[PDB]
Amino acid sequence: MESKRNKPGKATGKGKPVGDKWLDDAGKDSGAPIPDRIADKLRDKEFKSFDDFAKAVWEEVSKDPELSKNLNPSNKSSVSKGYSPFTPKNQQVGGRKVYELHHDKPISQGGEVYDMDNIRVTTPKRHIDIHRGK
């Protein structure tokens, strides 16, 4: 096995319309989708790895006034560097304190790495709840 997430690939997919409180949704259900406007900016671009893709996602968030507007000034500085914003304390798990990008259909069962319709934005707590129920 070689890791697909560690290999370059091309972003695809549509994402979904979201509101300015989109990140509140990362803590419930299956997480928040990739915002359609983020998908529009990233689609058809090639990325070096899934980590490289995730950085581009957070950069695009900081550049979109609607998606970054609920972020406080410190969280805004974070996304401007391409880091994931910090979740509320009550959504953190140990050293996992920032929003996470996860694959909805697992890559091992045919989920695509850079398929933006296969990616969910979760809090560490929500991801762990989901994972523990599998």
């Binding site: 406080n72 509320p88 304390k89 050293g95």
Partner: protein, 82 residues
């Protein structure tokens, strides 16, 4: 780096500013600083002091330092060096 009373207030303000500015080389290094901040303040709001302030709390660097400082004063905990 062991306990908040190892920092002068001016040192702690620098630390807090680093965090608010995301003045690090990586996300990992920022999360490490944030963890240390929470360990230093011992405040139960944790990283929320920085990222999710209560309505009408000052979330500037000096604002955060003052909130920490007063909370520790109110709760009989040690202050800053010097």
């Amino acid at each position: 780096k062991h306990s908040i009373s190892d920092y002068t207030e001016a040192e702690f303000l620098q630390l807090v500013t680093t965090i608010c500015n995301a003045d690090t080389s990586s996300e990992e290094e920022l999360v490490k600083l944030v963890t240390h901040f929470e360990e230093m303040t011992e405040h139960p709001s944790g990283s929320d002091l920085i990222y999710y302030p209560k309505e009408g709390d000052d979330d500037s660097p000096s604002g955060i330092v003052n909130t920490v400082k007063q909370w520790r004063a109110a709760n009989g905990k040690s202050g800053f060096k010097q």
